[PDB]
Design a protein around this ligand. Structure first.
Ligand SMILES: Cc1cc2nc3c(=O)[nH]c(=O)nc-3n(C[C@H](O)[C@H](O)[C@H](O)COP(=O)(O)O)c2cc1C
Ligand SMILES: [Mg+2]
Ligand SMILES: [Mg+2]
Length: 169
């Protein structure tokens, strides 16, 4: 297996596009993409480094495929894993629930032993509240393809360099 498993869900394809750009930055032989619409929770056993990608849907909820797999996360352990998070979301239209999904996923995975890496500054976002907040930072990379698509590539580039260092790769 590759070093990093990137498990993403997507409804309108935006988080998947972001997943592909992250894979391109790390390299094809470093990151393997797993669409959680077809993944089994035991797939997570194949990796000591994880990237969890999830947009927030209506409203403050996990993307439907990730919602489906969320209950099964208790059937697997994350001891010794390093885990990063990214999501797409809409900070203008959903300012009270911006990036809730990655907050919800990290809460669970860290409770099951996964150590979170890749915290991200809230600088440059306009929102009211988020379940991804952790001591004034986002729990992971927050992208906004609806309102800030022109910032996405630079954000990913900066985050992956940061992440590579935190993973120790
Ligand atoms: C009706 C609906 C509800 C949404 N709710 C939220 C939300 O609660 N929080 C958020 O950050 N974004 C919300 N969004 C924005 C989406 O998360 C955003 O468009 C994202 O890029 C979609 O990712 P995907 O294409 O991978 O499914 C919502 C979008 C729609 C249309
Ligand atoms: Mg397997
Ligand atoms: Mg449970």
């Amino acid at each position: 297996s590759a070093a990093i498993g990137l498990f993403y869900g997507t409804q309108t394809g935006k988080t998947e596009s972001v997943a592909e750009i992250i894979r391109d930055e790390f390299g094809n032989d470093v990151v393997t993409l797993h669409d959680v619409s077809q993944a089994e929770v035991t797939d997570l056993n194949d990796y000591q480094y994880l990237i969890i990608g999830c947009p927030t849907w209506n409203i403050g909820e996990l993307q439907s495929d990730w919602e489906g797999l969320y209950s099964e996360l208790d059937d697997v352990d994350f001891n010794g894993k390093l885990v990063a998070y990214f999501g797409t979301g809409d900070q203008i239209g959903y300012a009270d629930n911006f990036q809730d999904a990655i907050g919800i996923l990290e809460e669970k995975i860290s409770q099951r032993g996964g150590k979170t890496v890749g915290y991200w500054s809230t600088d440059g976002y306009d929102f009211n509240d988020s379940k991804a907040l952790r001591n004034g930072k986002f729990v992971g990379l927050a992208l906004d393809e609806d309102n800030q698509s022109d910032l996405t590539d630079d954000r990913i580039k900066s985050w992956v360099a940061q992440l590579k260092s935190e993973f120790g790769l």
